[PDB]
Every structure is written in structure tokens, then in C-alpha cells.
Amino acid sequence: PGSEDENKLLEACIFKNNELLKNIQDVQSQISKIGLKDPTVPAVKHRKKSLIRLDKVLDEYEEEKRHLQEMANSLPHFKDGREKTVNQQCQNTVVLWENTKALVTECLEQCGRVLELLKQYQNFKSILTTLIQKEESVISLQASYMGKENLKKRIAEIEIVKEEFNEHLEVVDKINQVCKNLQFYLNKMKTFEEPPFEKEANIIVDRWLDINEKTEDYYENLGRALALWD
Amino acid sequence: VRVQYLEDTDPFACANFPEPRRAPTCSLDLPLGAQIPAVHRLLGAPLKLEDCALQVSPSGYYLDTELSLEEQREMFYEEISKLILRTQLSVRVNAILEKLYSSSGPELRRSLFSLKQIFQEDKDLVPEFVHSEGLSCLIRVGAAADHNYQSYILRALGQLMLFVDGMLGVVAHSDTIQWLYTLCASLSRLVVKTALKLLLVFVEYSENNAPLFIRAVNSVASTTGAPPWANLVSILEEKNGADPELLVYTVTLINKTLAALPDQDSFYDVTDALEQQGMEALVQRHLGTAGTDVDLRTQLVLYENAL
């Protein structure tokens, strides 16, 4: 081999390690700077489009990492021992790549689960608010200003409405849990001035209770008014 | 067999998924108090050391900071021979009691509505709750709130009494039963229906608490200035209007309170106190009119057969 060619190989190993290491460091700086525009499906999948671009960038560096490990395990053995320090730096850079790749996988995983949860949020919210708007727009005359047949007719309608309310009460529980999980996975991506889906949970729960209480009061008023017609 | 956290500091905002996804490993340790900080930093969890405890993975058992070798002998099963760090039940029920004693308006309403779910989906919270005067809390808010706040409190309470420990807690808490009898005089027909059927599950769970019920009614009658049982018979006199339904619940309650009592001397005591108020006139008057529904009629003749 030769001391000249040995040092020229050792130095090539240093060169490739410094070059590869800063390329990986660049990828991880870019990862941290991605963030998230809004807690919406369009914004989340823009975040994921960017993570996937960077995943492909790390992939293009896999073969360089692997050639680098090659060089490091085949380095000449000097009396100095300096090959051992350069090998340790190279093993570091390889672990850096594995860590960066794991980071990207974790971000992509949490994007996936936020996307499933946003889907579930809009499906549950549609179910609930259309039930709530349906009852919320139907007329409600004063029970005091109603005839006996009309009281009977409206009371029957309000039992149907109550039974549907009882049925979707599970959906109310499901959407509360979905919002809780959405906060958890969303805080991993960005710091939010105000908690992202906590306002939303409170608003939907508040509407649901308002319409339930209103409908229950209306029901008992219908019954009291009906009692006066004997 | 491996360790993981769950952030449950706010019980009104539990995330559901334990992290990390791929559990870090630790396998042995044998006192636990001194050993929990090592794992709390192994995880770097946003959970206050202090107020932390460890729960076994499939079973849910919360470890006593004692021995691994004694909790061993308590309980793992066969798998070991081939785990979540979270907040103490103490600390979580304290946050619950805090929220209830310190909030108002819309927050309060939301929280009471959530209690049902919180207790339903973490069953083990209910005993510690009873241990922390949680019932005193519920009543001491409910006795001052409108019928809507009260109906949420009652849904939570019925959830508690589905569990044996919650049932025993109310068997200890006289104020609860007193409040339910007071609630049989509510102007909300929903609140009355709910209070009554809670009083029914209360007297149906055991038999020894028929006397507990009869005493609660006597105690409230004495404080309030009214005759004993005025709320039940007031419901019987359909002053709000017809309610076959409420009547059936009320009469079945008075029936199985009678049928579960050895004292014929206390039984004649209570049946006097109530035919005094018009019970027999009501019974015959309902037994006549054929608008009476079969369920109800069946139970009124049960009363009369007792007499």
C-alpha cells in the first residue's frame, strides 16, 4: 500500500464524511423549518408532501452513507491510531443518517394519524350539526297558544327528536375523543397560540347541550299546556 | 413487559394513545419509590415525578410503591416467566374536584356533562372519588343549580352507582339519598324521573338500605318542616298532570321499600304516615278508572295486597 496512498485514502474518508454529514445536517434543518400552516387537511398534507420530498433526499444519500461505511471498515491501520478517530466520526455520521430517517418516519406517521382524525372530525361534525340544524329550524309555537290536537301532534314529533338525540349521544362522545387526540398529535408538529381543537370541541358540545336542554324544556311545556284541555 | 407513558394530567382532556409508539425497554429493578425517577427520565415524560405511579399494561393494576416482589405475589400472569407511567388516581380526582368546586357557567356545565364519560371509561377513578368527598361535592353543587345542571350531575351519579364501589359510597353518604328525595319535588319532570329511578336502583341493589332510604326521607321531612313522604305522594296526585310512567316508578319504589323491611312495626309506622296523606284515596281512585295502565294497576294491587 504505502504511507502516501494510505494517507490519501484516509483523507478521502474524512472528505466524504464531512460532505455527507453536512448534507444530512442540511436535511434535518429543513425538517425542523417545515411547520404547519393551519390544522386543516390541505395544510397537513402540504406538510406531508414536504416530508416526503425530504424522505426521498435521504434515500438518495443512503448509497453514499453505505460507501462511507465501506471505506471506514477498510481503513489502513496506522501506528498513530488516527484511523480509529476517523472511523468513529464516520460511524457517527451513519447514526446521524439513521436518526434523521427515523425522524422523518415519525413525522410522516403523525401526519397520517392527524389525517385520519381530521376525516373523523368532519364526518362526526356533519352528522351532529345536521341533526342540530334540523331541530333548530323547526317551528316552536308557544305551548300556551296551541290547541289540543296541535299539542298532541307536536309532542309526538318531540319524542321522535328526543330518541334520535339519545342515539347520537355516542357520536358526541366520539367527537370529543377525536378532538382530544387531535390536540395531542397536533402539538407534536407546531406550537399553537391557543389550543387548536379545544375551541372546536367546546363549541360543538355547547350547541348539542343547548338544543337538548331547549328541546326538553319545550317538551315539558307542551305537556303542561296539554293538561289544560282535559 | 416494556415501559411507556400516558399523559393524563387533565382528566377532562386525556389523550388516548400512549407514547412512545415503540416502547423503550427496561426489564428489572427492589423498592419502587427510589426507582421511579430513573424511568421518569428514561422517558423524559411531561409528568411530575412526585404525583406519578405505574400501571400494569393489560390488567390495569396500579402498583404500590413497595416491592416489585410483593406486588408480584399480589399479581403479569405467566408471560413474565417467558407498562404505563402516568399520574396517580389521587392527583387526577383532585383535578376533577378542583374543576367542579372552582368553575361556573359554561365550563361547569361542560365538565359535569363529561363526568359520565370520565367515570365510564376509567372505572378505577370512582373509588378514589368517593374517598375524596366527591359525593359531598356533587350534592353541594346540585342543591344550588338549575334542573339542567342537576340532570348532568344525576347522569354522572348513576354512572358511579353502576360500579360496586360507587354504590357503597352512596350507601355511606346520607346527604345523597336526602338530595334524591328532595329532587322528587323538582319542577323538572326529567329530574324527578331520574331521581326516582336512582332511588330504585339504590333500594334494589341491597335490602339493608331500605331503612337507609326511609331515614333519609324522615330527616329531610324534619329539617324542611314538611310531613314525611310528601314528595312521593305529591307525584302520586298528578298535580302537574297525567304521568302513568312517573306513577309506576313511584309506586314500585314504595312497594319494594315495604317488601324489604323486617320490622312490621316500622312498616306500620311508614304506611300510617302515608295513608294519612291520602294514599288510600289515591290508590282506590286510580284503581277505578280504566285509563290506568297495566303496569301501574299491577303495582297498586301489590300495595293493597300488602295491606
UniProtKB/Swiss-Prot annotation, chain A:
Expressed, tissue-wise, as follows: Widely expressed, with higher level in kidney, adult and fetal liver, stomach and placenta. Weakly expressed in skeletal muscle and brain. Isoform 5 is highly expressed in pancreas, skeletal muscle and heart.
Q: Where are the Spectrin repeats?
A: 6-105, 106-217
Give the record's PTM text.
The disulfid bond with SUN2 is required for stability of the SUN2:SYNE2/KASH2 LINC complex under tensile forces though not required for the interaction.
Subcellular compartments: Nucleus outer membrane; Sarcoplasmic reticulum membrane; Cell membrane; Cytoplasm, Cytoskeleton
Assembly state and interactors?
A: Core component of LINC complexes which are composed of inner nuclear membrane SUN domain-containing proteins coupled to outer nuclear membrane KASH domain-containing nesprins. SUN and KASH domain-containing proteins seem to bind each other promiscuously; however, some LINC complex constituents are tissue- or cell type-specific. At least SUN1/2-containing core LINC complexes are proposed to be hexameric composed of three protomers of each KASH and SUN domain-containing protein.
Domain note for this entry? The KASH domain mediates the nuclear envelope targeting.
Task: Say which family it is in.
Answer: Belongs to the nesprin family.
Q: What does this protein do?
A: Multi-isomeric modular protein which forms a linking network between organelles and the actin cytoskeleton to maintain the subcellular spatial organization. As a component of the LINC (LInker of Nucleoskeleton and Cytoskeleton) complex involved in the connection between the nuclear lamina and the cytoskeleton. The nucleocytoplasmic interactions established by the LINC complex play an important role in the transmission of mechanical forces across the nuclear envelope and in nuclear movement and positioning.
Q: Which disease is it linked to?
A: Emery-Dreifuss muscular dystrophy 5, autosomal dominant: A form of Emery-Dreifuss muscular dystrophy, a degenerative myopathy characterized by weakness and atrophy of muscle without involvement of the nervous system, early contractures of the elbows, Achilles tendons and spine, and cardiomyopathy associated with cardiac conduction defects.
Instruction: Spell out the protein name for this chain.
Output: Nesprin-2
What is this protein's gene name? SYNE2
Q: Which residues of the full protein are shown?
A: 1425 to 1649 of 6885
Curated annotation (Swiss-Prot), chain B:
Domain GBD/FH3 residue range list: 34-307
Q: State the tissue distribution.
A: Ubiquitous. Highly expressed in spleen.
Is Phosphoprotein included in the keywords of this UniProt record? yes
Where is it mostly found? cytoplasm
Q: Does the keyword Ligase apply?
A: no
* MF terms (GO), sorted A to Z: actin filament binding; identical protein binding
The entry's keywords: Actin-binding, Cell projection, Coiled coil, Cytoplasm, Cytoskeleton, Phosphoprotein
Q: How does it assemble?
A: Self-associates via the FH2 domain. Binds to F-actin via its N-terminus. Binds to the cytoplasmic domain of CD21 via its C-terminus. Interacts with ROCK1 in a Src-dependent manner.
Provide the domain comment. Answer: The DAD domain regulates activation via by an autoinhibitory interaction with the GBD/FH3 domain. This autoinhibition is released upon competitive binding of an activated GTPase. The release of DAD allows the FH2 domain to then nucleate and elongate nonbranched actin filaments.
Q: What does this chain do? A: Required for the assembly of F-actin structures, such as stress fibers. Depends on the Rho-ROCK cascade for its activity. Contributes to the coordination of microtubules with actin fibers and plays a role in cell elongation. Acts synergistically with ROCK1 to promote SRC-dependent non-apoptotic plasma membrane blebbing.
Instruction: Name the chain's protein.
Output: FH1/FH2 domain-containing protein 1
Native organism is Homo sapiens
Which gene specifies this protein's sequence? Answer: FHOD1
Residue window of the full protein shown: 18 to 334 of 1164
